[PDB]
Amino acid sequence: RIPQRISHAEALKTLCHPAIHDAGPCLEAFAQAGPPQGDDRVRALCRRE
C-alpha cells in the first residue's frame, strides 16, 4: 500500500506519439467500410469539401 499517481503528463510517452496522430490506418479503415444504410446517412452524403 504505497500511493501511486497517474495522469496525462506521466502518460505523456504514449500520448505524444506520432503513430497516435497518424490516422493513416484509421483513414484506410474509414475508407473500407462505406456509408451504412440509414435515411440520415444517405442524405448526409453531400458535397462540401
Partner 1 sequence: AWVRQATGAGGPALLHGQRATCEVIL
Whole-Å CA distances, 5 to 1, 9, 18? 12, 11, 25
- Would you count residue 28 as binding partner 1 (CB under 8 A)? no
Which of residues 31 and 46 has its CB atom nearest to partner 1 in the complex? 46
Q: How far is the CB of 38 from partner 1 (least distance, A)?
A: 7
- C-alpha 29/C-alpha 23 separation (Å) is 9
Question: How many chain residues bind partner 1 (CB under 8 A)?
Answer: 3
Length of the chain: 49
Near partner 1 by CB under 8 A: residue from 1, 32, 39, 49: 39
